Amino acid sequence: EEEESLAILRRHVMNELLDTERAYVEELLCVLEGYAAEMDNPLMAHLISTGLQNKKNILFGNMEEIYHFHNRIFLRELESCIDCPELVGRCFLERMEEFQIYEKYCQNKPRSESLWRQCSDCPFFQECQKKLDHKLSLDSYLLKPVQRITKYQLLLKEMLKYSKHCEGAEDLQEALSSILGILKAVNDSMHLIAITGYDGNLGDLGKLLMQGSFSVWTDHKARFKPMQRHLFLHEKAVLFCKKREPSYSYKQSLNMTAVGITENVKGDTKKFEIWYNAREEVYIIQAPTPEIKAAWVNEIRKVLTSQLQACREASQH
């Protein structure tokens, strides 16, 4: 049978989502009780440096914030769908604003890792672990939030699989796409936070739309010896960085204005070019694939279109 069989599979996924969810909450909690709360416990003070004590947030990030969310809102809302799993895509959608917390958590994560790398042996932790009777150490839990977002993606991807014809299939997709969005976001953010030497706050130049590596030549008015640069496509600019032999050193910017693009060059479908003025300034960028190139050129069109019409009806002021 069809319907009877699919529905039973959908219910199977809903169980995992809900089983793992509960576990997720429980996990974050034992760490906030088992470790975080303990950094503030007088009785434990003799095992914790006067400084590490402060690093409590650097180490945990907004885990608590995340915990309350999933404990007070999300789980409760996910469970409502126990009888109608096809429509669980509504929750994820309606809370994408709340999910922004994950971006904050990941952003801090690298620093946490630096700190953890520098004091993981510390007696304090060893103790908390005994008391908890944990086979594993704090670091494997600090990783839980990061993963949870992907589990969602996989689960949502699975739900839709057995719901293409159900009411809500629309939301499922949207939700799925959105999660993928958060993931792309988080991933791009990680690269941007590894940019060094950018005199100023690389936030006043719009949101990061794309980042990735390319080979760059400059036909301005070196044989075929390109530089390997990591590009960051923002709303107001395109940053060029060198990947340190992951980290990147800022090289130069390209004000996203008066820009002239060349959607196609002869030589390879992976070349497109960014240039300024009448072309006495030109950048030939080679993407790692003609596909990538497509996207970048495309995302760039959008920006100029946007950058452009960011005056068209904005000049009467």
**In the chain, helix, strand, coil percent, each to 5?**
55, 15, 30
The burial class, CB within 10 Å (0-12 / 13-18 / 19+), for 315 is exposed
Please give the Cα distance from 307 to 256 (Å, whole number).
8
Q: Given the structure tokens 């672990």, which residue do they identify?
A: 129
Q: What is the residue-wise DSSP string for 210-258?
A: EEEEEEEE-----TT-PEEEEEEE-SS-EEEEEE----EEEEE---SSS
Q: How many residues does the chain have?
A: 317
Q: Rounded to the nearest 5°, which phi and psi values hold at 227?
A: -105, 150
Please give the Cα distance from 13 to 136 (Å, whole number).
27
Instruction: Name the CATH topology of 194-317.
Output: PH-domain like (2.30.29)
| Contact call for residues 196 and 247 (beta carbons, < 8 A) | yes
Delimiting residues of CATH 2.30.29.30 domain(s) in the chain: 194-317
Half-sphere exposure of residue 106: CA atoms within 13 angstroms, side-chain side: 24
Q: Is 285 helix (H, G, I), strand (E, B) or coil?
A: strand
Other residues' Cβ atoms within 10 Å of the Cβ of residue 160: 21
Please give the Cα distance from 141 to 60 (Å, whole number).
10
Which method was it determined by? X-ray
Helix or strand (DSSP H, E) at 3:
helix 3-31
Please give the Cα distance from 186 to 101 (Å, whole number).
11
User: Angle 63-68-70 (CA atoms, 0-180°, nearest 5)?
Assistant: 95
- What residues form DSSP beta bridges with 282? 275
C-alpha separations of 182 from 98, 102, 104, 193, 204 in Å: 11, 8, 11, 16, 21
- What residues form DSSP beta bridges with 243? 248
Tokens of 240: 């060029």
Strand order in the sheet with 271-276: 195-196, 248-252, 238-243, 227-233, 210-217, 281-286, 271-276, 259-262
Other residues' Cβ atoms within 10 Å of the Cβ of residue 167: 10
List Cβ neighbours of 170 (8 Å cut-off, separation of 6 or more).
89
Other residues' Cβ atoms within 10 Å of the Cβ of residue 9: 15
**DSSP one-letter code for 9:** H
Instruction: Name the CATH topology of 1-193.
Output: Dbl Homology Domain; Chain A (1.20.900)
- To 10 degrees, what angle do helices 169-192 and 101-117 make? 40
Tokens of 134: 């944990």
Delimiting residues of CATH 1.20.900.10 domain(s) in the chain: 1-193
Task: Give the amino acid at 235.
Answer: E
| Contact call for residues 66 and 98 (beta carbons, < 8 A) | no
Q: Is 275 helix (H, G, I), strand (E, B) or coil?
A: strand
> Considering Cα of 146, then 57, then 63, then 40, what sign does the dihedral take?
positive
The burial class, CB within 10 Å (0-12 / 13-18 / 19+), for 124 is buried
